[PDB]
């Protein structure tokens, strides 16, 4: 598993835990759920590049305490 911090413009700090190989698609939908807004109403970025659903934390080379920014999808 791995620890990831999801932050946004409003500084909303929400931490998570997901396996190193788990489909990031899940957490993508998860945050939208935890929050309370439509799925395609938020965009997730990491190291600049946008995070795709079929992506893998092992592919992105993510690590503990890492951060993932979230911007209202436009």
């Amino acid at each position: 598993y791995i620890k990831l911090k999801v932050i946004g413009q409003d500084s909303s700090e929400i931490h998570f835990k997901v396996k190193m190989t788990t489909h990031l698609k899940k957490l993508k939908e998860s945050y939208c759920q935890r929050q309370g807004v439509p799925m395609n109403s938020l965009r997730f970025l990491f190291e600049g590049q946008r995070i795709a659903d079929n992506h893998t934390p092992k592919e992105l080379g993510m690590e503990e305490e890492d951060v993932i920014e979230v911007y209202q999808e436009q």
Binding site: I7, G8, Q9, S11, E47, G48, E63, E65, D66, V67, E69, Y71
Partner: protein
Amino acid sequence: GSHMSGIALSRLAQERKAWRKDHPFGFVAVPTKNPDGTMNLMNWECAIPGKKGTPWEGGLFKLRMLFKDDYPSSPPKCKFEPPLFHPNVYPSGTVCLSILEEDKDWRPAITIKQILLGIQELLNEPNIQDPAQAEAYTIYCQNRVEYEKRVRAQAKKFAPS
């Protein structure tokens, strides 16, 4: 391999480590990869987001950071790519700033976060006393309304697609 990069590579490794864990929102700082796929800590591709409430707001300006063998004794070379319209940015794209000068305000202890935040403040708070380019300077000084359009136009042209 640059066997003369021992100290820098060490310092850049911890620099990258500290950035991942915590860095300003909207910013980007990642090392480039070598011909094959090796991580090149001596050459970073960064991104500075325009500050909110300013004509730069919403823009995401890219610049490359280049470190020399003697770093952190000497500061990295910063250059916006492509060149940016701003009075303290040379036509070549090189950014003019005090903390990026060895003979001035640069201290080996200055972080990449500090450099990037320093450059972000320079965007909306230029230094007309020491202009790097003629055009942006002349416009800023002779027609600020026009200066604002250019900046807003530039911010729109570099907004995250």
